[PDB]
């Protein structure tokens, strides 16, 4: 590890880049759908074959939006996972600093601070667990 700190940062940058790509793609798909939805309403004169084409392209735009939106949703959870993992790593390192000092050198304030950091560290793990539970509740909901 310390390897893991770097790998966590790089993964977070990679996901942010993809999230930016998805945001751009979704707005372009939305504009394209609006344009084709307008063409279908305005151009009822037009042949059924051309309007069948527009209906088909609207259906495939809908499929791609759903796919992008599902990917976006999973990446947004991963972003927060990486943020929590980084926070836990920071608390872990801080607590190991307190722990590696001989007990004879600790003031009453040092011991109080060490206890507080341990409480914060456990709470970070509980926050990561709450994210796992969020995903399981969405899994159950998306299933029904």
């Amino acid at each position: 590890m310390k390897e893991e700190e770097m790998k966590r940062f790089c993964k977070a940058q990679t996901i942010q880049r993809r999230l930016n790509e998805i945001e751009a793609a979704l707005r372009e798909l939305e504009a394209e759908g609006v344009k084709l939805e307008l063409a279908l309403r305005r151009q009822s004169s037009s042949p059924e074959q051309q309007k069948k084409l527009w209906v088909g392209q609207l259906l495939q735009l809908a499929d791609k939006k759903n796919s992008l939106a599902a990917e976006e949703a999973e990446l947004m959870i991963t972003v927060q996972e990486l943020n929590l993992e980084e926070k836990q790593w920071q608390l872990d390192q801080e607590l190991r600093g307190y722990m590696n000092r001989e007990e004879n050198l600790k003031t009453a304030a040092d011991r109080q601070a060490e206890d507080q950091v341990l409480r914060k560290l456990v709470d970070l793990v509980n926050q990561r667990d709450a994210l796992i539970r969020f995903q399981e509740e969405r899994r159950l909901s998306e299933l029904a």
Partner: protein
Amino acid sequence: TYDLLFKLLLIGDSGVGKTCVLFRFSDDAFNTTFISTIGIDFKIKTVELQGKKIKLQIWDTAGQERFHTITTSYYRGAMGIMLVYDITNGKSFENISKWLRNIDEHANEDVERMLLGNKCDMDDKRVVPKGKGEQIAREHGIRFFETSAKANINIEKAFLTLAEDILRKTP
């Protein structure tokens, strides 16, 4: 993205290798430097069993006595628990009786329990004969494996076996 979420838990004395056993399973890697677990942690590993995508949330506890009260908060959610001792550390095996009592007190009544005798690569420093692990597992009706995080012995088999036993009673 997955079909089922299983919660696993690793308990046992400090130093027996709970964290390395998990790291070998999650990462196929071993690291020789001892970094003792502080309080509690968990890792995620998704596996495929009988055509189902099973997300394993594997909780790793601190074996140091100082953290006992923190760790007992996490027994009740567990669907399977690995009790880990060190085949080179006689005291680690004597304390398995105590860890079983902890499960009795704090875990769900029908949790799956599995005994792991770890560091089975240290045959020449062995203190606990394999028959004693087999015998105490027979006495509690639980599965038993001798494992090695360093040599990658029985790591996948232990975790996948426990997951299959949980899955077998899932509907």
